[PDB]
Structure 1
């Protein structure tokens, strides 16, 4: 997670402990064509072709949110170090040049195999907002994403 934002950008990170093996948590996150497996905001996702670096997916999010759609490109997928990186290239949201890095690491939680998930991001600060407003907004969504990933991963154990 070597993120270092310019002056017109902001950056932060969130973490979450999952009581599930790494291979189980990784099997959900790594499926770039179906983020709705664990993301509670995604209603529909379309992605053409084979999953590879440069693959682009189109996401439609449910109502109640500031945006309705997003276009995202897969920038990195390491099936050995468990690294996933995604960059937002389009949509109707206010997260321009958003780039995120998600990593999964093994650990022992309550005497059983567990998982630590870390997700950091860099994004432009939209006009009319501050770095801590933007960070607060993105952190709220990411914690909701990771909490749903934890509950889905822990129902598969």
Structure 2
């Protein structure tokens, strides 16, 4: 929660909602970050990603076109890399396209060092602010985004822990 106020404080306008989710991973920070930082390959840990196309090298302003698997209310999303800080291990992305209903979606993901069971571990925190789509409440929006992000982090933890013993 000391990390939340420094890197995850959002000021959602009234027509918006903001929230966060966390996950403890039993793996070192450099490994988790090495997976997250690969902005061009989110399906490395993101379980709902079927494909991902990004052109050129990774840089601020890079845009990736993501296709998601079936069983979801959308099929594609277009995302731009806004922040990729390797020193502080911060990754910020904005949804700039897609056929979904998360307009002006912005997410901040940070990776912090932790001690899990007396061994090196990682605390991952992802926060977001988004517009509440017509016909939905702020709570509905948050339960949706939180369900999705909880899947993403769980998967990230399985991938990371599967690479460390």
Confirm or deny a common fold (TM above 0.5). Answer: yes
SS state of the match for residue 116, structure 1? strand
Cα distance in 2 between the residues matched to 1:128 and 1:4:
22
Query: Which deviations, in whole Å up to 9, do the C-alpha atoms of 1:26-72 show, x marking residues without a partner?
Result: 00000000000000000000000010000000000001100000000
Structure 2 residue 149 is matched with structure 1 residue 147 = no
SS state of the match for residue 155, structure 2? helix
Query: Which deviations, in whole Å up to 9, do the C-alpha atoms of 1:78-97 show, x marking residues without a partner?
Result: 00100000000000000000
RMSD: 0.5
Query: Which deviations, in whole Å up to 9, do the C-alpha atoms of 1:98-148 show, x marking residues without a partner?
Result: 000000000110011000000000000000000000000000000000000
Cα distance in 2 between the residues matched to 1:107 and 1:122:
26
SS state of the match for residue 120, structure 1? strand
TM-score calculated relative to the size of structure 2:
0.94
SS state of the match for residue 153, structure 1? helix
5 Å-filtered alignment, 1:6-45, equals 6-45=13-52
Shift of 1:2: 2.3
TM-score calculated relative to the size of structure 1:
0.99
- Number of residues of Structure 1 aligned to a counterpart in Structure 2: 157
| Structure 2 runs not aligned, ≥5 long | 1-7
Cα distance in 1 between the residues matched to 2:10 and 2:58:
25
Out of 99, 117, 130, the position equivalent to 2:124 is: 117
